[PDB]
């Protein structure tokens, strides 16, 4: 049976992803090289393994709750999501800690970036293989175990727990799954950013500002720890991140197919005539999953081809050149899967088939070509190639004030462009197969997110043997086939924010369509569907709630930005300590103290990283037993608008400060070299950029997800139990 | 009948502020007198040439109106137009007289009475002028059209040529606001590029490159720093405030307009209707009553111990005056009225009053939350400034944290007054809120005002050899002024939020035809946001709203880069400057800014001006109502962010002049970062923060506007 094939593709991506680690070891690694890289390993390993047991430790609290109040199922999903989301994070950090060192070797003694391209490539390609498998492994288990081997899917039902709970159980288990693994992603990726981004802007700022010493110097006692923040925040909480979006897109449509069934219904005499044919439902509710997983092989077979394909001089060719590919043989097999599966089915116009079976293709192409754009406007906004990068760069010589403002517009102005993407994607894929249609276009802007995670994991590797080459003092060629490799990262890394906001947004409005539907009970079963998709916006209550959810994501974006900011004064303080204390280290014959810094940054973000997945979680709850279900509508909504603008700006205008800087650093700009003045404004406008890019950036997208889907969980209860 | 004496207030407001500006425009001179003049001069052409511009587009505007809506509509458009241009000239001349009067009063008396005397008196001009001319105009349209020629006694949807369905009053009042709003935005934008784009250069260039001292006369770029405040923050302040104040009026005056056709057979008798399109101009009269009171009893009385000491005192008891007067009013005119139930009066005809009184409270909560949030006093702008010691990228990161931060509590607060508004009084609350948060309108547009003559003073005391004292008292009152600025932009945007929730109600009213007249009210007040075009319409919104800052700043910072190579190639190329014996070239720098302003000013406007059009056109009603969504959220969140924010980074660079670190003293590096971080700042507090609400407003009122023509009529 193919079905059987299709459903094992995960595991193969698993298999090819341990085949590629097994590649990637017996490679050659100098002592000084393995010190280095067995130090940074440690401090990766030790971080991620605290960070991981308080996660799993509020995660079975939260299975516990979830057990209790909905189905014990749920919490069963929710164990198996965080788990899969826990284990793409630890394998995406183990690779790149094993490859950091490998392509910086390569680099070294070929002298070519065919060889260290490849073993990046491999590190990434590892690392997004784990990713879709992972996320595509637990989601199909899922899906066999409590719907194909308990039958949830079979019943599809609107049920009543105790204490009043309304719910569908196989609804109710795929959110259990998306909560978990986007709990556990919230959790990782908030901890990684906040020490990464602290230890960056400490190490940079004092080094090339203060004491004039090379980037990643051996001298600087936060070089270390700068290096283990890009190893851990920006590699596993990467995975964690794309992994969520991942599992939300495609859950957003499960959901949407599953709640369609139980509501399509027409009451006559009392008799419901159900309108909806069951088994249309069950090839609706297996068609983002069955899509997702040939997305998945083509990825596969794509990444196969690069690895074994000719190495080009430019990484950014390859790799786009595999997207490319990938995305094409994808469109084509997904269109046939998508007429097959549902070749000569009944209902799909009564929701929201216009054109017919292929319609949710259609919208899946909107999304693809949507996702596109998205990044093509992020690469001409981000990078010095284009127009806008290079006035930031050419604003370094009035100053640091004019750098600092020119990049803030730059992010206000930038999210324009993308946004209206998004608004005719929006409306083009519900033209073509409603919002079931909308979730679709969600899952089809990431159907390749092993792909993108892959590169944007190949990017970090290349940072870290950067690192590397600077404090084992190795020829200062190896060091610049390095930042080649790092300069294209960053723009890519900017592109794959972009593809995950995106997704994000479509599979929020598909959540909002299924928060509706849930806010449904059995006495108001039969209600047609056009009054359960109402959200009166002329409600003080619904505006209201918009105005606190947009108020409460800025708040949020505030708090990460003093977290990063209070570890990074810390930092400073330590380094201008160390640096006066300690005789020698200036001049190369003292060898100053890490583990002061390491353990400053890990304390500040073990101990600040729990609140903001609280609060993501505790504001539904809390607003919606306050001020009933519109409120909360009210509240999702101005959460969306308000975590997309700020996300898009804020990933937008720090990629864009960081590669003016690498643009002055290159010598490109005329006269003015590293020790100058506008290279110090330059410096300071990528510190006030690595919290935005890689802290506030991508926490948005997983604050809305799982805030719509805590929201779509809880709307049963606080609908009667609102105090006001 | 006192009706006649209500309709006379205003005048008395306009009489009360030209005897407060001849009084003090003794304008005591000191020694050469002549830098005053010159300022005065350079501040009259810029002010000059913008006004010849904006009324040039106004014409343009006032004849399309009269050719697709009602030619009242344009005249009534016209005359708000010249009311907001009337108050903002009047500003913007009584503040370049009177700078240099309070400064050398102040020098001579060495004492912070005498000045704080002056100045208040120039803030109390200001807000009188502004306050009059709203009444003025808005009284005279009212008699005019709604009482001589009957346009309240109609009170019907009418259908003109064309095909667009309208309300007379409706059209009239929308048209006022409209010209009002439009001449405000472009005021407010070319003031306020001008005058941050010249601080921010003059600030880095002197400060932190040249090490010299602030609004040292070496520095080419002073007389520019105190022309531009002239402009865009004594200008500008009172177009952006007095179309506030319009706009709140003119809210609550649409939404009851629109409501007697609407609802049907006629469920609310007509005198109701007009009893409550007439309470809202009876209760700005006495608000602006109120506040007159409250500035004579200031004016007249000895010197306050602290100079936030006498705003406050004086705010107090204006608002305790008008909250007691507004009862008795709201009392009397509506108590034996019938069917204000059907409207939403939960209470009765106490409710609006009630809605007007949270309106107030949660506009002193948004100050309250201000002065915590921009004060040094307190401890987050203590933690900014202990930030410098940490760099500068430390410093602007600790700041932006700080005004993303800020924007909870007053968003809170809004979320409460919104949700007890609907309570009481029903959407007509949401508006009659609207306005009574900004009931004393006067009194804050003089305190805010006050600040910038402070500035001015200091400026020009550092221009001209003087005494330290002089200038210590000068920035003394001007570190209070800023906060006064952020307190007042917060009523500014709490208002405006109130404003465009009533707008989306008078919009949806709007959306209705004759022959689709019988609809009941509860099918008409919804406004789906899941459906595709409205959420697609919200994002689109926001990302307008975005990129409308984005460009602000953009042009903002493009003439500061001009500016700052202008003055480096100065101090460069000129012998002697930088030495103290010489003298540069401030027409330079001043044509520069001036040129930029001219150039830049125009985008803006249009931008807001034909968003609702082409997006109407292209989409349909509801992508429109969804953007209008989109562009309030983002622009209430903007604004809020930036004004904190900036007034954050100022009042701590303010924090390290006074001494208050230890150690650390001025020019030290430290102070360099705390000056960057008030730099990147100035942009967001006086140019992107307050254009926003002006967008919104003028956005939802074109829409209103238009919204007959384009429901039906779209490509798309
Ligand atoms: O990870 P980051 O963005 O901090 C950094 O990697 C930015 N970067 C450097 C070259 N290309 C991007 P670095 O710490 O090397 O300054
Ligand atoms: O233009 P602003 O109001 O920011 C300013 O007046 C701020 N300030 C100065 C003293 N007290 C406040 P200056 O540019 O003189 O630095
Ligand atoms: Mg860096
Ligand atoms: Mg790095
Ligand atoms: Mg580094
Ligand atoms: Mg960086
Ligand atoms: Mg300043
Ligand atoms: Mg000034
Ligand atoms: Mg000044
Ligand atoms: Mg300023």
């Not at 947004?505 to 047609?528: C, E, H, N, R, T």
């Not at 990933?651 to 100058?676: F, Q, R, T, V």
């Amino acid at each position: 049976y193919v079905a059987a094939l299709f459903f094992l593709i995960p595991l193969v991506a698993l298999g090819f992803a341990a085949a590629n680690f097994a590649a990637v070891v017996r490679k050659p690694e100098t002592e000084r090289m393995k010190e280095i890289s067995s130090y940074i390993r440690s401090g990766a390993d030790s971080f991620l393994a605290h960070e991981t047991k308080a996660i799993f430790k509020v995660a079975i609290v939260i299975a516990i709750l979830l057990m209790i109040f909905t189905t014990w199922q749920t919490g069963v999903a929710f164990l198996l999501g965080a788990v899969m989301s826990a284990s793409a994070g630890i394998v995406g950090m183990k690779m790149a800690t094993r490859a950091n060192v490998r392509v910086a070797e390569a680099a070294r003694t070929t002298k070519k970036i065919g060889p260290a391209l490849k073993v990046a490539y491999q590190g990434g390609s590892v690392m997004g293989l784990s990713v879709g498998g992972f996320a595509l492994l637990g989601l199909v288990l899922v899906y066999l175990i409590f719907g194909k081997w308990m039958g949830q899917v079979d019943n599809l039902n609107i049920y009543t727990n105790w204490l009043g709970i309304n719910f569908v159980p196989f609804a109710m288990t795929v959110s259990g799954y998306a909560l978990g693994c986007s709990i556990i992603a919230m959790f990782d990726r908030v901890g990684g950013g906040v020490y990464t981004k602290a230890a960056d802007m400490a190490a940079d700022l004092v080094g090339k500002t203060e004491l004039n010493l090379p980037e990643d110097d051996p001298r600087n006692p936060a070089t270390i720890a700068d290096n283990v923040g890009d190893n851990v925040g920006d590699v596993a909480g990467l995975g964690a991140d794309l992994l969520e979006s991942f599992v939300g897109a495609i859950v957003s449509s499960i959901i949407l197919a599953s709640y369609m069934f139980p509501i399509y219904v027409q009451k006559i005499g009392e008799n419901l005539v159900h309108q909806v044919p069951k088994e249309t439902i069950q090839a609706l509710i297996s068609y983002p999953i069955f899509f997702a997983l040939v997305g998945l092989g083509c990825s596969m077979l794509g990444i196969l081809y690069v690895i074994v394909k000719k190495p080009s001089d430019n990484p950014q060719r390859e790799l786009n050149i595999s997207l490319w590919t990938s995305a094409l043989l994808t469109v084509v097999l997904t269109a046939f899967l998508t007429y097959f599966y549902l070749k000569d089915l009944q209902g799909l116009d009564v929701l929201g088939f216009r054109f017919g079976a292929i319609s949710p293709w259609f919208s899946a192409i909107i999304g693809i070509f949507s996702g596109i754009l998205i990044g093509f406007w992020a690469e001409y906004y981000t990078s010095y190639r284009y127009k806008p990068t290079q006035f930031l760069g050419k604003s370094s010589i009035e100053g640091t004030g004019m750098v600092i403002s020119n990049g803030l517009s730059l992010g206000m102005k930038s999210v324009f462009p993308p946004t209206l993407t998004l608004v005719l994607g929006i409306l083009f894929a519900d033209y073509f197969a409603g919002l079931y249609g909308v979730a679709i276009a969600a899952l089809g802007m990431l159907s390749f997110v092993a792909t993108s995670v892959s590169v944007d994991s190949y990017g970090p590797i290349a940072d870290n043997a950067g690192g590397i080459s600077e404090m084992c003092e190795l020829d200062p060629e190896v060091r610049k086939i390095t930042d080649h490799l790092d300069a294209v990262g960053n723009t890519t890394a900017a592109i794959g924010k972009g593809f995950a906001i995106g997704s994000a947004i479509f599979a929020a409005l598909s959540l909002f369509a299924s928060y509706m539907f849930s806010q449904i009970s059995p006495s108001d079963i039969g209600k047609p569907p056009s009054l359960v998709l109402l959200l009166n916006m002329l409600d003080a209550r619904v505006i209201a709630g918009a105005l606190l959810g947009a108020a409460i994501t800025y708040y949020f974006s505030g708090y990460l930005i003093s977290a990063v900011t209070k570890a990074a004064m810390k930092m400073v303080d330590e380094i201008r300590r160390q640096a006066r204390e300690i005789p020698g280290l200036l001049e190369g014959k003292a060898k100053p103290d890490y583990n002061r810094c390491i353990e400053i940054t890990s304390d500040n973000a073990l101990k600040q990283m729990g609140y903001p997945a609280f609060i993501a979680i505790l504001t539904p709850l809390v607003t919606g037993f306050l001020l009933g279900a519109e409120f909360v509508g009210g509240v999702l909504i101005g959460t969306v608008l308000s975590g997309a603008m700020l996300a898009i700006l804020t990933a937008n205008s720090g990629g864009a400060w960081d590669n003016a800087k690498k643009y002055l650093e290159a010598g490109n700009l005329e006269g003015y070299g590293k020790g100058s003045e506008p290279h110090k404004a330059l410096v300071i406008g990528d510190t006030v950029g690595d919290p935005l890019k890689d802290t506030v950036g991508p926490s948005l997208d997983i604050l809305i997800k799982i805030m719509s889907v805590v929201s779509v969980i809880a709307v049963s209860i606080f609908k009667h139990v609102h105090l006001f």
